[PDB]
Amino acid sequence: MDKKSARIRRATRARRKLQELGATRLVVHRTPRHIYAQVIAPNGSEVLVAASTVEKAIAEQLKYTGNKDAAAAVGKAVAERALEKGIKDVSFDRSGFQYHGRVQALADAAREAGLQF
Template identity: 35%
Template sequence: MTAIAKKRIQSRIARHERVRKSVVGTAECPRLAVRRSLSHMIAQIFDDENNKSVAQVTTASKEFQGKFGEMTKTEQAKQLGLQIAELAKSKGIESVVFDRGGYIYHGRVQALAEGAREGGLKF
């Protein structure tokens, strides 16, 4: 890994730590966390008070790839947002706190957030 890549990762982690000081998920309003890699994304809903993961959806799953595998990564992120919203609704969650994970609110992260809002989540 080059020095530039290490610096980029360290900067993202520092941003995430800064954001996590104020973004906390509760049982009434859990935290929607985003994890992004070069090829896939993970959306996970956390209850930080009880240290539990309430729901998780990933683009790497076989079911997701079977339905949406031919779409672009940004379109897949939007579908991921719709799926996490549907899963949250089925568990009785109406509103969440969005944790972008230190990533810039742009591109795939923004598409996931918009998809979750379209699915009915409030944040």
């Protein structure tokens, strides 16, 4: 029983609900070394904005690329990248991860940066 397939099972219900609501969701993927963030169109097939720690434009200004304060950088970056693009209200898709620690630090940072969710 891989931890991944058990995690997609945890994320399926919320994603179906967001798909039914027709909302533009902020997807978050978390690895032991990196953290990722995507804003998907309501149709679920277009990536509007994206930000992560594998981008050197953000990675160079971090001590370690996979700790809690690194997630706050991606949260701040993905929000201001989306605000100027025109998206203001989204829905946070924790995607099977517990809303705690790094993904929580990513969320409130994006919430602090002016993304309404």
